[PDB]
């Protein structure tokens, strides 16, 4: 029986809504996910998926979740992730998540295509959810590495990032 992913007010995720991705951890290891410039990146647009070093400063870049089909968002269902921010046409692809053993999460992807990067939201071993990258069990846990002193989201199958989804 399909289990809808829920936001922080118990409501199921809606592909028409925007959410910030927030840490289950708060304070010194809080810090929402945001769209940032990768170090020594040639792109004119921000192209990295980061998270802040704490949750007391800026708030997450909002994202939306595009299910491959239907109009609900279920656990273990394939989907694309896109930051939802005002941007010019050149940077639209650079709002869409894709993956570049440690593999950094970036933007530059496509949505709903065969070449797109699909993710799954699964229930976490503790509280909240983990994100899985699924090159379409053979998926890969999304976690954090430190890159030039910043928290960069990446593939790590030890210690995934436990997240919640707070509607904007």
């Amino acid at each position: 029986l399909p289990k809808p992913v829920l936001d922080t007010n118990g409501k199921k995720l809606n592909p028409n809504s925007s959410y910030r991705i927030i840490s289950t951890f708060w304070g010194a290891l809080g810090g929402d996910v945001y769209l940032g410039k990768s170090p020594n990146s040639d792109a004119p647009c921000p192209d990295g998926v980061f998270r802040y070093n704490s949750d007391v400063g800026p708030s997450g870049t909002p994202v939306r979740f595009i299910p491959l089909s239907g109009a609900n968002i279920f656990e273990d269902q394939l989907l694309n992730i896109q930051f939802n921010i005002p941007t010019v046409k050149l940077c639209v692809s650079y709002t869409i998540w894709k993956v570049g053993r440690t593999m950094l999460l970036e933007t530059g992807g496509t949505i709903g295509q065969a070449d797109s990067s699909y993710f799954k939201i699964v229930k976490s071993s503790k509280f909240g959810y983990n994100l899985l990258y699924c090159p379409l069990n053979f998926c890969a846990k999304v976690g954090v590495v430190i890159q030039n002193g910043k928290r960069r989201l990446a593939l790590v199958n030890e210690n995934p990032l436990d997240v919640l989804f707070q509607e904007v």
Binding site: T8, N9, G10, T24, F25, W26, G27, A28, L29, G30, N53, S54, D55, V56, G57, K126, F127, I146, R151, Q166
Partner: protein, 223 residues
């Protein structure tokens, strides 16, 4: 503060709000020109708000003082979470009165079981979001280093303590950051981090202030 209570006005006169356009961290007034807080609250510009009870309504007798100097601990690491302590030098000494007063630094470390008072303006919901306008309070015991290390396996250094309840329900939360844990009139803790809010076997984690009294007094006297 989840599951706390609204503090009686000006009963926590050492409590401060750090403002960057909005309330974002708590702190504690240790002398008339210095506030102690958490390093993960560092920001390039900070307004210190003293004598504050309702942070959304200017009553008239608050003191708003800009930080002149913001000193994070030199061995603070934002991903080991170790040494999460910060000092703020007021650009002008604060006026001490019934609403604005200092809290003493520890003269010993606090034994497990000691009742402490935690305070701040952070979230009051275990799940959703409900931030108060009025300062919140909670009395909670210092937990044993054994129970703290079992709740957070492999995360607790010698510079952190757990304060709260293995059972859950009462705890500090997002936005209490940098606020005081005062224990027999002594500042023993600084809200540092947690895993969820008021969840079972997941108490709040606090910088162990008694490990820093030398650094505080020496940094204050050098700056």
């Amino acid at each position: 503060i989840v599951g706390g209570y609204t503090c009686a006005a000006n009963s926590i006169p050492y409590q401060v709000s750090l403002n960057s356009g909005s309330h974002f961290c708590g702190g504690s007034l240790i002398n008339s020109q210095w506030v102690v807080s958490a390093a993960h609250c560092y920001k390039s510009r900070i307004q210190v708000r003293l004598g504050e009870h309702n942070i959304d309504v200017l009553e008239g007798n608050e003191q708003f003082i800009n930080a002149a100097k913001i000193i994070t601990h030199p061995n603070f690491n934002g991903n080991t979470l170790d040494n999460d302590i910060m000092l703020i030098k007021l650009s002008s000494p604060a006026t001490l009165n019934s609403r604005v007063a200092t809290v003493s630094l520890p003269r010993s470390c606090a034994a497990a079981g000691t009742e402490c008072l935690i305070s701040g303006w952070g979230n009051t919901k275990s799940s959703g979001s409900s931030y108060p306008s009025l300062l919140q309070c909670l009395k909670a015991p210092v937990l044993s280093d054994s129970s703290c290390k079992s709740s957070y396996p492999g995360q607790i250094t010698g510079n952190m303590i757990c304060v709260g309840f293995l059972e859950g329900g009462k705890d500090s939360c997002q936005g209490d950051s940098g606020g005081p844990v005062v224990c027999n009139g002594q500042l023993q803790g600084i809200v540092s981090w947690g895993y969820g809010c008021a969840q079972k076997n997941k108490p709040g984690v606090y910088t162990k202030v008694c490990n820093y009294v030398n650094w505080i007094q020496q940094t204050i006297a050098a700056n």
